[PDB]
Amino acid sequence: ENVWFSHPRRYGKGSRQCRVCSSHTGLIRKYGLNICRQCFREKANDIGFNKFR
Template identity: 45%
Template structure:
């Protein structure tokens, strides 16, 4: 019962990549092997201290 608007069953790049943290498949960043969506990436990046170099 999750018909909210239209859904696209097709996957763009063949594989569905989901965020390891929240499970979303939207805007998942696979750079650096993180496999995180944008929001989680931001949170994790702050936790890791991405802003502070050196």
């Protein structure tokens, strides 16, 4: 039926999902990287996000 997904998801954390683990909560949207915080911690070493201070 055509009313399976009637309710919108055009705002809120209904839209925003992580690009790695499909997280909805904790999604840091900044810079348009769309991954959750722990995924960012894990993948910073390999992407090139380096801790200096």
